[PDB]
């Protein structure tokens, strides 16, 4: 059933060159391509949350898209909720992973005050996430979405489509994000057609990075295999502006 789990101040880290994804499905190679899209700004302040420290796992704004990343070994983070009022009055998007699969549903979910998944539990998705749900319009099932392992996701909501990008890499850091460039790949395009203004992270009963996308111009460097190996944020500094103008890293 629904139970109460619960406010602490935010910490901040730096997304040095993280949050870049392939802007489209067009193959390019051995070329510097200039594109305009919603990307995480370079060297920005990313909010670092500790959901378990006292439980504090707040609802955050979606804005124009969300940059989400986390590092762990136990796989405590299970999924996300995206919607508006996040109750039975509106359609909401529930994305939750388990050991063998991922289930994505859009329904009029009446979510719990402090929603979570139960390791030892109705159904697996219904344990502590919501009390009821009806009028389902979308259902999708596929393969799981989720030293230490760093998992990076970008969530966009454009013209009714909820677009998810992701990357999975090894990490050997404790306090902050890694340096270097790595682009996120398209994961799934979901033809849902709902309003998303806010979101929340679902845990199994924990820390994560949250940033936001901006209308930014980037110069992307594609190697001989069509992989992006670098990028320039054309609105970061005079040096980057010069590099973008001259099309040269």
């Amino acid at each position, epitope marked *: 059933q629904c139970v109460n789990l*619960r*406010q*602490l*101040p*935010p910490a901040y880290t730096n997304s040095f060159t993280r949050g870049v994804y392939y802007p489209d499905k067009v193959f390019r190679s051995s070329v510097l391509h200039s594109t305009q899209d919603l990307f995480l700004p370079f060297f920005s*302040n990313v*909010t670092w949350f500790h959901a378990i420290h006292r439980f504090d796992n*707040p*609802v*955050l*704004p*979606f*804005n*124009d898209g969300v940059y989400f990343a986390s590092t762990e070994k136990s796989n405590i983070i299970r999924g996300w909720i995206f919607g*508006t*009022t996040l*109750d039975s*009055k509106t359609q909401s998007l529930l994305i939750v992973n388990n050991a063998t699969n991922v289930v994505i549903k859009v329904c009029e979910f009446q979510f719990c005050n402090d929603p979570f998944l139960d390791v030892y539990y109705k159904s697996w998705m219904e344990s502590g996430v919501y009390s009821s749900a009806n009028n389902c319009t979308f259902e999708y099932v596929s393969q799981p979405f989720l030293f230490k392992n760093l998992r990076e996701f970008v969530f966009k909501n454009i013209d009714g489509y909820f677009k998810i990008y992701s990357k999975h890499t090894p990490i050997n850091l404790v306090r902050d994000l890694p340096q270097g460039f790595s682009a996120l790949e398209p994961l799934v395009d979901l033809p849902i057609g709902i*309003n998303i*203004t*806010r979101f929340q992270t679902l845990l199994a009963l924990a820390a994560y990075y*949250v940033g*936001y996308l*901006q209308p930014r111009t980037f110069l992307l460097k594609y190697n001989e295999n069509g992989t992006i190996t670098d990028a320039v944020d054309c609105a970061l500094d005079p040096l980057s502006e010069t590099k973008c103008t001259l099309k040269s890293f």
Partner: antibody
Amino acid sequence: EVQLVESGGGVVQPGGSLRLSCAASGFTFNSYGMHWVRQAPGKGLEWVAFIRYDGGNKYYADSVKGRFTISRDNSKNTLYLQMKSLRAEDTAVYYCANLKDSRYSGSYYDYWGQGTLVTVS
Amino acid sequence: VIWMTQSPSSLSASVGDRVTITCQASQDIRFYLNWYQQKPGKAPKLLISDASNMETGVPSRFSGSGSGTDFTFTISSLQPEDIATYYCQQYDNLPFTFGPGTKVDFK
């Protein structure tokens, strides 16, 4: 933990101008949009202006539209309101706030400042 | 612009009495109405959002409901600490607007 503090209030003559600011702390200011609300003595609440988290889109009440400008600086966590061509009718206590909003700004928590008095005479 | 009104503009009630406040919109705003409570010298506090959703920390004696143009705010049993001015506010569209405000006096 969360606070909003207004400053820059004072007394000006009609036709003059006054600039307000609000210092935000205890929360991720740069992820939320912000509102200005004013309340005259003996009167109810009146909404003034809204700015989105990225400092882009700006909205104003018709009663102040064309005279007031809303802006912000996310590197200093400070919200600003620039008041030009002030009238006697603009006398009010001005507040900065993060109003709970499930449609536009995506604000889950409702925050208010202390209020600063702006007098035009 | 959506115009808002409230009735009565003022009411008197004693402790234990049930207090109801009516907020009406000139336009249909579905379920996007906020209710605030203000005492002299302080900024307004949010009690109810989304027409009927209670905020964290708000006493169970407070409630409300409604949809479209006609909404009601209710205090099931007035306490001595509930003497305040209540406001309704719509956030269905921009600009945001507040109603006149209903003052609750102690009888």
